[PDB]
Design a protein around this ligand. Structure first.
Ligand code: HEM
Ligand code: HEM
Ligand code: HEM
Ligand code: HEM
Lengths: 146, 141, 146, 141
């Protein structure tokens, strides 16, 4: 986004240690648990009745991996998140009717998961850079709403 | 919390809205749709065209609910329980959206009540709308 | 921001009708009245104890005209707000220490003031153009915070 | 509204914080200053440098009040009256900022209570910080 080479490195390097599979299933499940109203989009996933039920739901897990997947690919175009997510931005608007606020909630969930995972390694300065990334991604995703 | 003053201000200004609440409710929606387009993601099933009967009908519903909260200014949590439940469990509108409508409700009133839309009334109406929003969102989690 | 030519004309046409002196005083006064916390920056202005005290305060009125004066100028450089507002941004940050949320609150108050003043002339779509405008200024004023 | 499970969850998590609360207070502030540089507008009289004794001490201060609120999870309003006053009439911090500190506090706990930071505990703590926020900004106007 407006990441400092140093900030760029920090993101880049932490990410290389990330198991997208696991992180994505956890980000998306925590989202459905902490902010229950986000479940309005996943009725078809099944039983989201309990934390246990969300976290275990494989439809959830698999959607999480698909989401982090795309996010992951986006960290490769940090200079053009806008152009990187244009089609996903129109999809989310025009087909899925997802309020961009959701993009923001996930971002924050995402940061809590990384801290959870990397403990010590997820320093204030490393968090600061991730925050700029999640905000940049949500902004790019909301970009084509009309 | 709403003070005696706030309550007088709100009953007074809403009093003036009178029979126009319906139209003012619809107007607030349109303003909302044009200025904050993300709000539309909640009405995919609506004709959001200018003078949509759907919007018209929706405006009355919102207005009737506000009128009902003024009527029960001393028992809003109870007077609005049903709507609180609906929003919490069915519609699941993200909280941030409430602030957007409030703002647009304020604009519509300003535009319609030059004489009553005083600094003091503005302040009271603002607090009021915040109160209603808090109620409608109280059962979210 | 994202102002269509027709949004730019609509902004400009109405602004021609505005009495910046009066609107300035009205918007600032109303801010201190609706969001009393905002009074934290004006303890040298005197009595802000009641609405009349605020609204009628010679100092609040004078400051308001100064703020809307700077704002009017921004309306002529709709192309380069960040540029236009840079020194002001650094000042608000470094000297005044004004939280940028204040700038968004004032934009909203201003939109209510224009609605108050123009009645029906302040159409749904005229308001949409102004919302974009007040957001751009607020962004422009926060750009140099660090 | 905090449920019985929530209060339980909160009491457990904080229980583990223990002698480290001050340190976590401090780290959360540090994380906030860095991630949301606008929050620094309220601390112009502080040395915001890493390991600043001012930040340290304030960290302690914030932690302790949090502690006090867990202890009075049942009577927060009353337990934090003095604090809601200070914030509403003296400090006058914009309400938006309360969400930033809250988040940074979650982040800090996540980073330090791996085993304890489950999805259900995460939820409860969030709701808690939100309740705390509400109390602290209830006398704003
Ligand atoms: C980091 C932000 C996000 C990214 C990169 C992202 C990306 C994706 C991708 C790649 C798909 C695949 C669908 C397709 O290509 O046809 C998808 C679908 C979808 N996303 Fe997003 N997403 C994000 C956030 C969210 C959030 C926060 C929600 C809701 C809380 C959401 C709701 C959905 C839904 C409902 C679908 C459709 C799934 C289906 O077809 O069953 N997305 N998203
Ligand atoms: C203080 C503000 C609000 C009030 C008083 C209010 C009131 C109402 C009422 C009375 C209904 C109709 C329920 C029925 O069928 O009996 C309704 C429905 C609805 N509201 Fe809310 N509401 C408010 C805020 C919002 C916001 C901010 C949004 C989203 C932008 C929203 C989205 C909806 C939707 C999508 C429906 C269902 C519409 C339909 O399909 O007919 N509401 N609201
Ligand atoms: C549209 C947004 C704004 C614009 C264009 C603007 C413009 C200005 C200008 C031109 C000055 C005088 C500069 C100088 O002293 O060299 C000023 C001063 C100041 N502004 Fe802003 N302002 C804006 C919003 C705000 C808001 C919302 C607040 C507070 C809630 C604020 C707080 C102040 C203060 C406290 C001063 C200094 C007053 C004094 O002389 O003691 N400003 N502003
Ligand atoms: C989690 C919610 C918060 C809690 C529990 C909290 C608690 C406290 C406490 C216990 C004090 C010290 C009171 C004393 O000195 O006796 C304090 C002071 C203060 N707080 Fe709040 N606070 C919260 C949120 C915030 C936020 C979000 C900000 C600004 C971004 C803030 C800004 C301040 C400032 C500027 C002071 C005075 C510091 C000084 O001058 O020493 N507080 N707060």
């Amino acid at each position: 986004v407006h990441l400092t080479p140093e900030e760029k490195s920090a993101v880049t390097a932490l990410w290389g240690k990330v198991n997208v599979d696991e992180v994505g299933g956890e980000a998306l499940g925590r989202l459905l648990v902490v902010y229950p109203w986000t479940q309005r989009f996943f009725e078809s996933f099944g039983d989201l009745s309990t934390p246990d039920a969300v976290m275990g739901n494989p439809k959830v897990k698999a959607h999480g991996k698909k989401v982090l997947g795309a996010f992951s690919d986006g960290l490769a175009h940090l200079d053009n998140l806008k152009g990187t997510f244009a089609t996903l931005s129109e999809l989310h608007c025009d087909k899925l009717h997802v309020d961009p606020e959701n993009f923001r909630l996930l971002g924050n969930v995402l940061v809590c998961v990384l801290a959870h995972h990397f403990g010590k390694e997820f320093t204030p300065p490393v968090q600061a850079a991730y925050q700029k990334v999640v905000a940049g991604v949500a902004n790019a995703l909301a970009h084509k709403y009309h | 919390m709403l003070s005696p003053a706030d309550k007088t201000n709100v009953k007074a200004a809403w009093g003036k809205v009178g029979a126009h609440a319906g139209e003012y409710g619809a107007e607030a929606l349109e303003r909302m749709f044009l200025s904050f387009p993300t709000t539309k993601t909640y009405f995919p099933h609506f004709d959001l065209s200018h003078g949509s009967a759907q919007v018209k009908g929706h405006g009355k519903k919102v207005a009737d609910a506000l009128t009902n909260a003024v009527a029960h200014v001393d028992d809003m949590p109870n007077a609005l329980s049903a709507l609180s439940d609906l929003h919490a469990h069915k519609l699941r509108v993200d909280p941030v959206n409430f602030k957007l409508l409030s703002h647009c409700l304020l604009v519509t009133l300003a535009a319609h009540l030059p004489a009553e839309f005083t600094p003091a009334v503005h302040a009271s109406l603002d607090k009021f709308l915040a109160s209603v929003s808090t109620v409608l969102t109280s059962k979210f989690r």
